[PDB]
Design a protein around this ligand. Sequence first.
Ligand SMILES: Nc1nc(N)c2cc(CNc3cc(Cl)ccc3Cl)cnc2n1
Length: 186
Amino acid sequence: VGSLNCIVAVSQNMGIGKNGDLPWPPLRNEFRYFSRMTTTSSVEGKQNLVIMGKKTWFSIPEKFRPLKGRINLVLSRELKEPPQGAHFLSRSLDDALKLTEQPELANKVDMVWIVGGSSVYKEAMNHPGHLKLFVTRIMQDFESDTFFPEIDLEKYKLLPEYPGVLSDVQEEKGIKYKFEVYEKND
Ligand SMILES: Nc1nc(N)c2cc(CNc3cc(Cl)ccc3Cl)cnc2n1
């Protein structure tokens, strides 16, 4: 299995959701970036795995589920089988990553991308090991009801650039944003 990664877009007051939708109007190129980063696999004959909580799964418009070209795994203790359109179900993050070593996944998965929501991000971020965060900073405040966990900069180093990742300020629908990549290894 390849690298372990979180990807997120967050507003200036750390918001990632309001009522199961984006705090901000849709940003088409920002989404294109999320799709390209999560879908692109370095390794022939493998796909990337996306891991998400139940609420994150149901927040994706039906037409985009499952995320195409990616293996889709949902996390839930309540659900007893993968939701309609999803591929895998695990009770927890540690379980999902364990499954990634089983015969049925071991040779199929390249990168793993955690795509939300708050508790799954939080658990990943303080679990020892090599982890990157791909963070889009939406540089305004947006009313939100779910939030990104604190990034501990003592552990997470902001990379000065990354191949495939624009370094400069982006702007869509009047809203400035920028892409960042953080890395820890502990
Ligand atoms: N950088 C970044 N990282 C993520 N994890 C993202 C996740 C999504 C989720 N997809 C989606 C979700 C809702 Cl709530 C409404 C409509 C759509 Cl198309 C969209 N953009 C993302 N950008």
